[PDB]
């Protein structure tokens, strides 16, 4: 019915097998049961062996040992250094007797992640004769947000319908949920919100007795795979389903209603993760988001729940005429002032950028600006503005640029990753969340290669220091095999895809220029005169948003001095973000030597040629990939090439018609 | 529940009444029954009298006589000249005895229209002491097309939900259908298609036994008011509900299926009007529209049904890059060549313009170009591109410009009205159709004053020679009374509204510049790079579509020599249509003396001020109009003023940003 994605566990040849007679499972918990089953599955499929599962080591048998520190006979030094609950150690016994692999986790979850790491080593064909590994995740929260609706639709879903809901109910099918959990767990994802942040009528009832049994059934599966379950809530629930006259967070009965709702939820799901909130809301009653979030936080506190408060807030009724109002400044101006007013179990979830998941956006100034408030970054795996899984776009490189961005909050070495992993400000709760890119499509992600974005998200969530190169390598090998041509080719495609897509879309960081509504395809003035605050201000002389303090919106001042100065100056501002920070003449000379207008022409003409190359390189792999996936991808790559041509021409023509400046190289621009 | 619109029958004062003791109804048919009931209603409400209904004249009683020629004792000369079946004569007896009013119709329908004319005279307070009237409609078909869907929605409906359907079924309520029929009949409308031309799944079943009983129930009501009922059909019905493998009009079984469908329909509705068709279609199987239409025509022929084939056909996948392809030429190039190949009961329905109901479009070249093919013009009463009933837009003046347009098909005096009334080419069937502007809203049309467009459509349909001035006068008096200030003010508002709306929307006939999808509001580049063939080609130097033969698409050649030459020349082409026919520099000087760019600024700034005046004039009527309607309209006028400001600024800014030319008068243009 559907692909196994990167958990193929392809059968090894006779020269790449392992000899094991037993699996020693020191524990019998539901998680351990899933761990054992997964190990059996991988070893059976890959090695064609079926070790017996036991609870005590057989001194003379080759074994894989699974357990926690408390299960050890002799606690060696390495595992003794473990402090993170989800951390683990994998080491081969150094003695000369039977072969033994020890997978030691700080907790059961640790053993689960350790096993998937062990299986990953096998899929990649690593020598496990002398292993000595210690791994602890950097981010406490490694979450996935689903924008699934209960009618089956998925907001911004380009990979089919929801695998959770249908006909305003839960799918009677749960086997796919189990395989999805296995996939998420394989890359360390430990938290999930199953419903759209835009909570509609039916979804509002997910926190009521009518649907809680079903939610609990889903949570039971995820729990088995070390995944905590969350629900996006409707802030107006007290009114819509509570029978109350208001949703005011300060109203005594409203506060009580939520506390009772929390209690009720925990009776079905004892380890419920908490609420994800997109917010009639607090503003409706003159309350600020601290008051709004803290009320929900107080309801969940007794149960250990968390409130994930999204900071995607802005004036969705902005006047395009007013160049003093800047949507990019909204998030910071709204939350920065509230630092230190939020309850301990509240985590502010902030998008990587201050606008809205554009192909390229500078880093949200909020990161590093709130020392006393937990923060978590939200990235979008589903490609809303990045190709919608029609165009290939491996998002890992972009996410690393964001994660490695130094905010200088506490001087050099204050990278975003250190802000969200909680080390910089000692955040009790923090991490990263990704908007799911899956659907009912057999290949899960619409575009076969988009599977790499989900895999990659998990890898970065676990350890942001991993290189895009090794993440791509791991994914390709596990998904398509180790043929050097296949690996080198697909890895190259993945690693260069984002830049290629940006080349023929929005120029120099200004973003947008997409069709309104569905957001797919070129439309330079699409939202140019809208009330969404997404403008490029292109005219016959130049383009760009002046966000300088000197003459613009003053957005640059939201960054710490080092970055503020870099963007403030027209001479130091990076080319790739120039139009996001400065309004400049088309003739303005970039650091690359190109005028702004010629740069536009260059990347659009050249981006299309690069897209053709992606397709050509893929075609050269025919015969080395099964026919089904070969054609699924070829189909998409062709769709990409044809659409890229539309992006190229629409943008080139628009700017030629406005600037009146011809392409330096005389390439075809339709007048 | 809803307003009576123009059939108010307001109670007259004691000095404006009539003395009648009897109504002589010479016939007992369902139509006559409705006629009598309407007369009783009007006389009771207006005159507070209740004449007894009799079948024989009382020599000594003041009476209103109703009958046809065959019912007359003495057939006078006037009614003796009647030839049209729906014509009638109204004359006061010239003798000195009792007062007698004779309403003589050629057929029952004629008597119905005669009575409504009599009632109209009373509502307007005309002296009926010495009447001598003869009226015969110019257009055989005076039709209304409904874009209602069975789920209750109305495509391009801005006046509420369908009054016909709900929950994929017919409304159990029929009283509103009766009052709607009364309204349509009052203005001579004699035909109606009750469902959307875009026939969806459920609507496709309107031609099956499952829904025919309901359709018949609706048709029974309309029949009583002289209205023939039609259904829009799904050309693919043979496949969707017929169980056949194809819809090919030349497939033997397909032809048979339609003939059987027709027979079945006529068993429920003996006088069924026929099918309205928007067309898997003939093109799908390499057949032309003559073959497509003739197949349906052959099925209806034995029953006297008609096939209304819409010519709204074009490449909905046009390349914006190709300036040689012109959507405006499509309709003519598609149908002109087929003249003389259509069956006698087929009528080609053509929109007033060759594009798509824009605020201003030149006349469709098809009118006058097909001497051997019946034609009917389609106009849009619902204001899709003309304010959507938020902005006031009395469409009658525009329709008269189209109707009075001389095609010169047979030399001077070949106006569009003479083409569609069938007199120019002796068309057996022809006329005019209007896309309904009603909905479930209590005031029927969303905007109270939009009621005038429905009324006006009927009046022009009956007699295109009626002036916009008298049509507006009739409507205002009947709807709001005869206070001279009220009449003069509302009439002025109606008569100037269209020009006002055009002033702040699309300039000089180029059209569009609307938001995509819903089509409401400014968005200059909205469809500029779309595949719909709706482009203005504005750049930093000029704007316009070159449709000349000399250098453009050659669209001008579709008109007869006299009009072709007028539009072909840049010097003779009317300003109001200049950008539809020529691409010109912004500095091009118009006949008005304005440069094209300054004209744009002028009409947009001034159009807003004119809109403010509409509101001001309405406010001055407070106290002379009931509070409910006064405020309903004031609300809309305020909405109009505010939106006009958006139209003004968006368009002015777009062209300033592109042309770089400032407003001559230094008015506020946001940079
Ligand atoms: C779920 O709503 C989404 C929305 O579809 C998307 O287009 C954007 O505006 O951001 C959103 C968000 O992150 O709330
Ligand atoms: C019913 O479809 C409509 C359509 O809503 C409208 O936007 C336009 O394109 O013309 C149509 C037509 O007259 O078929």
TrEMBL record, chains A, B:
Gene Ontology cellular component terms for the protein in this record: extracellular region
Domain Glycosyl hydrolase family 67 catalytic: 122-444
Keyword set, alphabetical order: Carbohydrate metabolism, Glycosidase, Hydrolase, Polysaccharide degradation, Xylan degradation
Residues covered by the Glycosyl hydrolase family 67 C-terminal domain: 445-667
Xref: InterPro entries: A-glucoronidase_C_sf (IPR037054), GH (IPR017853), Glyco_hydro_67_aGlcAse (IPR011395), Glyco_hydro_67_aGlcAse_N (IPR005154), Glyco_hydro_67_C (IPR011099), Glyco_hydro_67_cat (IPR011100), Hex-like_dom2 (IPR029018)
Reaction catalyzed: Hydrolysis of (1->2)-alpha-D-(4-O-methyl)glucuronosyl links in the main chain of hardwood xylans
Superkingdom field: Bacteria
UniProt keyword Hydrolase present: yes
Binding site for alpha-D-glucuronate: 155-156, 198, 310, 351, 356, 384
EC number assigned by the record: 3.2.1.131
Family the entry assigns: Belongs to the glycosyl hydrolase 67 family.
Subunit structure: Homodimer.
This protein's name: Xylan alpha-1,2-glucuronidase
Source organism of the structure: Geobacillus stearothermophilus
């Amino acid at each position: 019915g559907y692909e196994p994605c990167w958990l193929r566990y392809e059968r090894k040849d006779q020269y790449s097998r392992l000899r094991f007679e037993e699996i020693v499972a020191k524990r019998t918990s539901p998680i351990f049961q899933a761990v054992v089953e997964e190990l059996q599955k991988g070893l059976r499929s890959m090695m064609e062996i079926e070790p017996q599962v036991v609870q005590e080591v057989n001194e003379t048998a080759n074994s894989i040992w699974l357990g926690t520190l408390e299960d050890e006979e002799f606690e060696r030094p390495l595992e003794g250094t473990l402090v993170h609950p989800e951390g683990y150690v994998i080491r081969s016994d150094v003695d000369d007797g039977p072969f033994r692999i020890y997978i030691i986790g700080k907790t059961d979850a640790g053993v689960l992640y350790g096993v998937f790491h062990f299986l990953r080593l096998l899929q990649m064909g690593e020598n496990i004769a002398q292993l000595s590994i210690i791994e602890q995740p950097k981010n406490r929260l490694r979450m996935i947000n689903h924008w699934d609706n209960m009618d089956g639709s998925i907001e911004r879903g380009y990979a089919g319908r929801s695998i959770f809901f249908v006909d305003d109910q839960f799918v009677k099918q749960n086997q796919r949920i189990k395989d999805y959990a296995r996939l998420l767990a394989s890359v360390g994802i430990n938290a999930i919100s199953i419903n759209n942040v835009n909570v509609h009528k039916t979804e509002t009832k997910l926190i009521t007795d009518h649907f809680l049994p079903d939610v609990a059934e889903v949570a039971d599966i995820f729990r088995t795979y070390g995944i905590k379950t969350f629900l996006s809530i409707n802030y107006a629930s007290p009114i819509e389903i509570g029978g109350l006259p208001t949703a005011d967070p300060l109203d005594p009965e409203v506060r009580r209603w939520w506390k009772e709702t929390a209690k009720r939820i925990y009776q079905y799901i004892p380890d419920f993760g908490g609420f994800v909130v997109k917010a009639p809301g607090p503003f409706t009653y003159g309350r600020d988001h601290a008051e709004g979030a803290n009320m929900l936080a107080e309801a969940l506190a007794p149960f250990g729940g968390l409130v994930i408060w999204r900071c995607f807030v802005y004036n969705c009724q902005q006047d395009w005429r007013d160049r003093t109002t800047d949507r990019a400044k909204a998030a910071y101006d709204h939350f920065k002032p509230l630092d230190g007013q939020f309850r301990e179990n509240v985590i502010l979830q902030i998008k990587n950028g201050p606008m809205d998941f554009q192909v390229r956006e500078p880093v949200s100034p909020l990161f590093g600006a709130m020392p006393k408030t937990n923060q978590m970054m939200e990235v979008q795996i589903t490609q809303e503005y990045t190709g919608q899984q029609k165009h290939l776009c491996f998002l890992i490189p972009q996410w690393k640029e964001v994660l490695d961005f130094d905010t200088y909050a506490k001087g050099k070495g204050s990278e975003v990753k250190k802000v969200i992993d909680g080390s910089l400000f000692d955040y009790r709760y923090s991490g990263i969340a990704g908007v799911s890119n899956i659907g009912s499509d057999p290949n899960w992600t619409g575009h076969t290669l988009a599977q790499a974005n989900l895999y990659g998200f998990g890898r970065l969530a676990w350890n942001p220091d991993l290189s895009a190169e090794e993440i791509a390598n791991e994914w390709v090998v596990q998904t398509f095999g180790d043929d050097s041509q296949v690996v080198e080719t697909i890895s190259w495609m993945l690693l260069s895809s984002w830049r290629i897509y940006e080349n023929y879309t929005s120029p120099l960081g200004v973003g947008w220029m997409v069709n309104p509504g569905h957001h797919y395809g070129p439309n330079v003035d699409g939202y140019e005169y809208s009330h969404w605050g997404t403008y490029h201000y292109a005219d016959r002389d130049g383009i760009g948003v002046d966000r300088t303090v000197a003459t613009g919106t003053g957005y640059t001042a939201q960054y710490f001095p080092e970055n503020a100065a870099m963007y403030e100056s027209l001479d130091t501002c990076p080319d790739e973000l120039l139009l996001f920070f400065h309004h400049v003449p088309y003739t303005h000379r970039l650091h690359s030597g190109e005028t702004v207008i010629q740069h536009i022409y260059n990347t659009h003409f050249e981006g299309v040629e690069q897209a053709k190359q992606l397709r050509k390189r893929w075609e050269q792999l025919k015969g080395k990939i099964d026919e089904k996936r070969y054609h699924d991808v070829l189909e998409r790559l062709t769709i990409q090439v044809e659409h890229a041509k539309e992006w190229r021409d629409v943008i080139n023509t628009y700017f030629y018609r406005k600037s009146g400046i011809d392409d330096q190289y005389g390439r075809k621009i339709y007048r």
